Design a protein around this ligand. Structure first.
Ligand SMILES: [K+]
Length: 265
């Protein structure tokens, strides 16, 4: 069993959007969340490799994965004990990983094929569209945009301590909290997770290190799906924690990883 470091995030009414700074966010809340648990860090390569090995014989195909990144390449798998965020994982890899972790912890899978069972293998081209999400499942999944944003902003704790309006997670200035390119940077690489300061929920690297896949769909014409990823990375300078972009679910890159959530009942 893979042991998971997660934090409970209390629910309630919250502001999600592009406004930052000292404002009365309580007066402008626009999304409702139920409580959920979130991983304190990005999933590490060491975690990813370990569940890969466990799930291979149980029918799950969790593919790719590198130990962080140095420029656009992977670090050697043993560097810093494999504690860099895993990179070069697709959205499919992430949600299959999520199902395998659910199984491991004897929880119900959130992502299922059209026949209602656990997604274990990425769908063949076309059959993509029959994949379902089970909102009653107790298992791990990718965060929604609202969940991820609220968590990045510190939730109720950030509201209480006045950091909810921080442009980056935990603090309005990025160097102390986020591995993101900065003026004159001479190095472009991931760091072991939780090398910088946390936000008010005790989460690490919501800003920077790797960008993070979300559950959130971005609707497009044609045969392909697209999903958000947020937060910036060691090579992707962003202006705030509200900056996201999108990719198809089969895509992977040296600066995109993930972290998971699960509902609390
Ligand atoms: K991150």
């Amino acid at each position: 069993i893979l042991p998971i470091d997660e934090v409970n995030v209390d629910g309630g009414d919250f502001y999600v959007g592009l406004v930052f700074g000292k404002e009365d966010y309580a007066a402008h809340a626009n999304t409702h969340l139920t409580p959920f648990s979130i991983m304190r860090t990005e999933v590490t390569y060491h975690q990813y490799q370990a569940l890969q090995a466990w799930a291979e014989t149980r029918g799950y195909q969790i593919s790719g994965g590198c130990n962080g990144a140095t420029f656009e390449d992977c670090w050697p798998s043993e560097k810093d004990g494999g504690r860099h965020p895993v990179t070069n994982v697709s959205w499919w890899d992430a949600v299959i990983f999520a199902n395998a972790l659910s199984a491991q912890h004897n929880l119900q899978p959130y992502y299922v094929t059209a026949d209602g069972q656990a997604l274990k293998i990425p769908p063949e081209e076309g059959t993509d569209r029959g994949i379902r999400e089970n909102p009653q499942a107790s298992g791990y999944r990718l965060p929604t945009l609202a969940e991820w944003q609220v968590a990045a902003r510190g939730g109720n704790k950030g509201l209480s301590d006045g950091t909810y309006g921080s442009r980056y997670a935990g603090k309005d200035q990025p160097a102390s909290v986020a591995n993101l390119p900065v003026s004159g940077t001479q190095t472009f690489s991931t760091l072991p997770v939780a090398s910088k300061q946390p936000n008010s929920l005790g989460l690490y690297d919501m800003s920077g290190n790797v960008s993070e896949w979300l559950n959130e769909n971005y609707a497009v014409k044609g045969g392909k799906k697209m999903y958000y990823f947020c937060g910036g990375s060691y090579m992707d300078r962003v202006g705030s924690l509200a900056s996201c972009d999108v990719h198809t679910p089969g895509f992977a890159m040296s600066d995109i990883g993930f972290r998971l959530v699960r509902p609390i009942d």
